[PDB]
Curated annotation (Swiss-Prot), chain A:
Name by which UniProt lists this protein: ORM1-like protein 3
Modified residues (Hydroxyproline): P137
Lineage of producing organism: Eukaryota, Metazoa, Chordata, Craniata, Vertebrata
Residue intervals annotated with topology Lumenal: 118-121
Family: Belongs to the ORM family.
Pfam family of the protein (one): ORMDL
GO cellular component: endoplasmic reticulum; endoplasmic reticulum membrane; plasma membrane; secretory granule membrane; serine palmitoyltransferase complex; specific granule membrane
Quaternary organization: Ceramide-sensitive subunit of the serine palmitoyltransferase (SPT) complex, which is also composed of SPTLC1, SPTLC2/3 and SPTSSA/B.
GO biological processes: ceramide metabolic process; intracellular sphingolipid homeostasis; motor behavior; myelination; negative regulation of B cell apoptotic process; negative regulation of ceramide biosynthetic process; positive regulation of autophagy; positive regulation of protein localization to nucleus
Outcome recorded upon mutating P137A: Increased protein levels; decreased ubiquitination; increased negative regulation of SPT complex activity
Transmembrane segments: 22-44, 45-63, 101-117, 122-139
Source species: Homo sapiens
Keyword terms of this UniProt record: Asthma, Endoplasmic reticulum, Hydroxylation, Membrane, Transmembrane, Transmembrane helix, Ubl conjugation
From Swiss-Prot, chain B:
Family matches, as InterPro entries: Ser_palmitoyltrfase_ssu-like, SPT_small_subunit
Annotated compartments: Endoplasmic reticulum membrane
One Pfam family linked to the record: SPT_ssu-like
Disease named in the record: Spastic paraplegia 90A, autosomal dominant: A form of spastic paraplegia, a neurodegenerative disorder characterized by a slow, gradual, progressive weakness and spasticity of the lower limbs. Rate of progression and the severity of symptoms are quite variable. Initial symptoms may include difficulty with balance, weakness and stiffness in the legs, muscle spasms, and dragging the toes when walking. In some forms of the disorder, bladder symptoms (such as incontinence) may appear, or weakness and stiffness may spread to other parts of the body. Spastic paraplegia 90B, autosomal recessive: A form of spastic paraplegia, a neurodegenerative disorder characterized by a slow, gradual, progressive weakness and spasticity of the lower limbs. Rate of progression and the severity of symptoms are quite variable. Initial symptoms may include difficulty with balance, weakness and stiffness in the legs, muscle spasms, and dragging the toes when walking. In some forms of the disorder, bladder symptoms (such as incontinence) may appear, or weakness and stiffness may spread to other parts of the body.
Pathway: Lipid metabolism; sphingolipid metabolism
Gene: SPTSSA
Annotated site location: Within the serine palmitoyltransferase (SPT) complex, defines the length of the acyl chain-binding pocket, determining the acyl-CoA substrate preference: M21
Signal listed as a keyword: no
Lumenal side: 23-27
UniProtKB/Swiss-Prot annotation, chain C:
Induction: Expression at protein level is highly increased in brains of patients with Alzheimer disease. No changes are observed at mRNA level.
Protein name: Serine palmitoyltransferase 1
Region (Interaction with SPTLC2): 1-44
TM helices/strands, residue ranges: 7-27
Domain notes: The transmembrane domain is involved in the interaction with ORMDL3.
Self-association state and partner proteins as the record states: Component of the serine palmitoyltransferase (SPT) complex, which is also composed of SPTLC2 or SPTLC3 and SPTSSA or SPTSSB. The heterodimer consisting of SPTLC1 and SPTLC2/SPTLC3 forms the catalytic core of the enzyme, while SPTSSA or SPTSSB subunits determine substrate specificity. SPT also interacts with ORMDL proteins, especially ORMDL3, which negatively regulate SPT activity in the presence of ceramides. Forms dimers of heterodimers with SPTLC2. Interacts with RTN4 (isoform B).
Homology family: Belongs to the class-II pyridoxal-phosphate-dependent aminotransferase family.
Tissue: Widely expressed. Not detected in small intestine.
Residue range from the parent sequence: 10 to 53 of 473
Organism: Homo sapiens
Leader peptide range in chain numbering: none
Subcellular location: Endoplasmic reticulum membrane
Swiss-Prot record, chain D:
Disease listed for this protein: Neuropathy, hereditary sensory and autonomic, 1C: A form of hereditary sensory and autonomic neuropathy, a genetically and clinically heterogeneous group of disorders characterized by degeneration of dorsal root and autonomic ganglion cells, and by prominent sensory abnormalities with a variable degree of motor and autonomic dysfunction. The neurological phenotype is often complicated by severe infections, osteomyelitis, and amputations.
Outcome when changing Y124A: Loss of catalytic activity with L-serine and palmitoyl-CoA as substrates
Protein name: Serine palmitoyltransferase 2
Record key words, sorted: Acyltransferase, Disease variant, Endoplasmic reticulum, Lipid metabolism, Membrane, Neurodegeneration, Neuropathy, Pyridoxal phosphate, Sphingolipid metabolism, Transferase, Transmembrane, Transmembrane helix
Highest rank taxon of the organism: Eukaryota
Transmembrane segments: 15-35
Effect upon mutating I452F: In HSAN1C; partial loss of normal activity as measured by reduced formation of sphinganine; affects enzymatic affinity resulting in the accumulation of the alternative metabolite 1-deoxy-sphinganine
Cofactor or coenzyme needed: pyridoxal 5'-phosphate
Effect of I427W: Loss of catalytic activity with L-serine and palmitoyl-CoA as substrates
One Pfam family in the UniProt entry: Aminotran_1_2
Listed EC numbers: 2.3.1.50
Membrane topology listed for this record: Single-pass membrane protein
Lineage of the organism: Eukaryota, Metazoa, Chordata, Craniata, Vertebrata
């Protein structure tokens, strides 16, 4: 419904990651993706793990660092009309439990997929490129800056 | 009796998965994808994993 | 644990160095107790 | 501050499995919404909506598409639970015009039949003054015959009448404060009087769940706004200490003023403000108090005077007491009560006093008659029976629903009962099922609330008899069995 009916906060999008059971749901979604990837018959284990890493990282990048704004009308007159979700999170507070969790989890996934890929160099470079693509925007310095003016408006 | 119970369980499935508010073709798409994934998983589990769970199911049936 | 140690020893040097610096980064985030707000204002 | 009576409230936490399933449902809805947006963009499926005129195709687009996402994909699916028209007085039973949609709620067609005798749990008449036959109706009819309907000028201009002065003095007597002023809209009261009191250089401490009118009034003024947690006295005290100690943000200077905006009863949450603690804190830290009393001016109190009587406090302690006649008295309008100097400054420097048309004569007559009946000027036994029946109904309904296994928010005294649904599909399911059984309820979803709690609000009334409550309770029990809405672990 309309924003402000049961809560005075102008931008609810900044609290969705601080809710109850959201972290458990995130981990369960990763696990379900891994299971449905293992379900494929003709794909080997290291390929499955690198696909898990790549798909999770791509989806995370798309949702956190690509889509900007809010999916609903907001009564602060579009203050966050250009900010992405990672920038909207917690009203710009750079370190928080949710931000720490979201930054840590791809690194743990990278460690697991490096162990299960037997440290192959091709998988190493693929997973490292993906991990950098996810971890670079999380830097506090890289806040509100668009390289070469891409996705600015 | 049992048909009513199964219809109730399907209703609960619709409520939980939010399929209740979708249109029929969206329900068809979601159900087809779900059954395809379950069938593929069963095929993989039978082909590769040993039938130890099948032995447990047979023991439970007996 | 011994098998894990052997598997780690099977890894190249640069990969292990990258994993170590990543672990150090994780420690830095975990112990980054300062909650900076990312703002800057000056008088007129 | 100390309480003369126990202060009981309960906000049970969400079960973890319920939260996980809620997130599953929201994710499914978001994915299918993205799919539908993709289909509509490529014209694969014809769009059933209005578009800009052909002569303005080269203009910048009026709206942003993404802002309408939840409107196109979530709100439109369950759109039929809202905006239900009625063709009768909003009493204990209401008549609802029936409508159907053939394109999934994108357009509604009106059938000739009319649903009759729907038990009303959505209207706001707490004391049951919404009647088409009575003494108030006759007084309003006489004043309509004499004065006409509506005034065509402003209070500072020729538009000030004697009825308005009578209403203001009667309101001042009813509240117990020295003086009061009356306006023609509850929203406008806040939006047009908060900017007058404070300005640039002052601080406003606003609760987490304030109404949109209070927030808009605070934004219109140039003051600084800081928000504390709902009914968290520790957070309020911490904010007060930090504000007094550290001064203004950029150029550290003492604050010109500190104003605390609070409400009597919070409608959606169902809780009552901890007034003794707020009063003690404002006395200790020298702050001013603005008390929105729209939902409690008739519901609460032994004689229905509001929260200040409910806690047995002194009305002179609250700097500004605002209120609304819409909820309890059955007529539109609003008021602000306080000391004489405040009322004079408001009469001189209020936006609605200078630029806005004043109240209507039949409305003020209805308010006067209702409030005289409440305070017992007519001498009839009515006016106390209403309050007693409202209290009994609230206690009975809340106890019966809590012992059925449901999760309920708020105090045991508030006549507003938020039942908890927790899932997006169960919102529409509950609305449709309850309408199918002749009960009218109000359901609130995600963007209005936090994500995990979506709810249904029951508004009790003094006009609800015992048989009506029993029928509603048995239907609610049946629906809760059907939809598995009994999440409570403590009692079931
Ligand atoms: C930025 C856009 C982000 C899109 C994220 C897509 C996530 C949804 C997805 O992958 O599956 C969706 C495809 O999704 C689509 O095919 C939609 C692709 C983008 C459409 C943008 C329309 C712009 C107007 C479909 O999901 P499903 O199989 O219905 O479940």
């Amino acid at each position: 419904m309309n924003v402000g009916t049961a809560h005075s906060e102008v931008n609810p999008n900044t609290r969705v990651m601080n809710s109850r059971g959201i972290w458990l749901s995130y981990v369960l979604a990763i696990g379900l993706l891994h299971i449905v990837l293992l379900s494929i018959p003709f794909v080997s284990v290291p390929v499955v793990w690198t696909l898990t890493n790549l798909i999770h990282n791509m989806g995370m990048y798309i949702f956190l660092h690509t889509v900007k704004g809010t999916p609903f009308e907001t009564p602060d007159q579009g203050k966050a009309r250009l900010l992405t979700h990672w920038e909207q999170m917690d009203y710009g507070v750079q370190f928080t439990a949710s931000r720490k969790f979201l930054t840590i989890t791809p690194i743990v996934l990278y460690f697991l997929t490096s162990f299960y890929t037997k440290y192959d160099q091709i998988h190493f470079v693929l997973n490292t490129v993906s991990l950098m693509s996810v971890l670079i925007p999380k830097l506090p310095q890289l806040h509100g800056v668009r390289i070469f003016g891409i996705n600015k408006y | 009796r049992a048909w009513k119970q199964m219809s109730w369980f399907y209703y609960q499935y619709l409520l939980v998965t939010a399929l209740y508010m979708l249109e029929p073709w969206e329900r068809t798409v979601f159900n087809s994808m779900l059954v395809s994934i379950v069938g593929m998983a069963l095929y993989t589990g039978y082909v590769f994993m040993p039938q130890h769970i099948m032995a447990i199911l047979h023991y439970f049936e007996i | 644990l011994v098998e894990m140690v052997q598997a780690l020893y099977e890894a190249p040097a640069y990969h292990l160095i990258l994993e170590g610096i990543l672990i150090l980064w994780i420690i830095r985030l975990l112990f980054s107790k300062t909650y900076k707000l990312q703002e800057r204002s000056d008088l007129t | 501050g100390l309480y003369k009576r126990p202060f009981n409230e309960a906000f049970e936490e969400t079960p973890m499995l319920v939260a996980v399933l809620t997130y599953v449902g929201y994710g499914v809805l978001t994915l299918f919404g993205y799919l539908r947006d993709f289909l509509r963009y490529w014209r694969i499926e014809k769009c059933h909506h209005a578009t800009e005129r052909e002569e303005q195709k080269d203009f910048v687009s009026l709206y942003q598409d993404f802002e309408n996402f939840y409107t196109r994909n979530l709100y439109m699916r369950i759109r039929d639970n809202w905006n239900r028209p009625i063709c009768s007085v909003p009493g204990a039973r209401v008549d609802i015009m029936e409508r159907q949609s053939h394109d999934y709620n994108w357009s509604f067609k009106y059938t000739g039949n009319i649903i009759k005798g729907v038990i009303n749990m959505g209207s706001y008449n707490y004391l049951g003054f919404a009647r088409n036959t009575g003494s108030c109706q006759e007084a309003a009819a006489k004043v309509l015959e004499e004065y006409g309907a509506g005034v065509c000028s402003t209070r500072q201009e020729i538009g000030n009448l004697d009825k308005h002065e009578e209403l203001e003095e009667l309101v001042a007597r009813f509240l117990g404060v020295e003086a009061a002023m009356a306006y023609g809209m509850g929203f406008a009261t806040n939006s047009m009087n908060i900017p007058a009191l404070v300005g640039k250089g002052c601080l406003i401490l606003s609760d987490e769940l304030n109404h949109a009118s209070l927030v808009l009034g605070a934004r219109l003024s140039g003051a600084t706004i800081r928000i504390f947690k709902h009914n968290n006295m520790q957070s309020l005290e911490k904010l007060l200490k930090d504000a007094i100690v550290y001064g203004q943000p950029r150029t550290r200077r003492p604050w010109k003023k500190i104003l605390i905006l609070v409400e009597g009863i919070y409608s959606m949450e169902g809780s009552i403000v901890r007034l003794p603690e707020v009063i003690a804190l404002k006395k200790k830290y020298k702050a001013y108090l603005y008390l929105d009393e729209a939902h409690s001016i008739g519901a609460l109190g032994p004689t229905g005077r509001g929260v200040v009587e409910y806690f047995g406090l002194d009305p002179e302690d609250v700097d500004v007491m605002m209120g609304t006649f819409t909820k309890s008295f059955g007529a539109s309008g609003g008021y602000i009560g306080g000391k004489k100097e405040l009322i004079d400054y408001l009469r001189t420097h209020s936006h609605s006093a200078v630029y806005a048309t004043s109240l209507s004569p039949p409305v003020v007559e209805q308010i006067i008659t209702s409030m005289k009946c409440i305070m017992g000027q007519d001498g009839t036994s009515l006016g106390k029976e209403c309050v007693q029946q409202l209290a009994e109904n609230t206690r009975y309904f809340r106890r019966r629903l809590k012992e059925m296994g449901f999760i309920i928010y708020g105090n045991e005294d508030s006549p507003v009962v938020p039942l908890m649904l927790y899932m997006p599909a169960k919102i529409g399911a509950f609305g449709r099922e309850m309408l199918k059984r002749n009960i009218g309820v109000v359901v609130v979803g995600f963007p209005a609330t936090p994500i995990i709690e979506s709810r249904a609000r029951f508004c009790l009334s003094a006009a609800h008899t015992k048989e009506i409550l029993d029928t509603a309770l048995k239907e609610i029990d049946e629906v809760g069995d059907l939809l598995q809405l009994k999440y409570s672990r403590h009692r079931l």
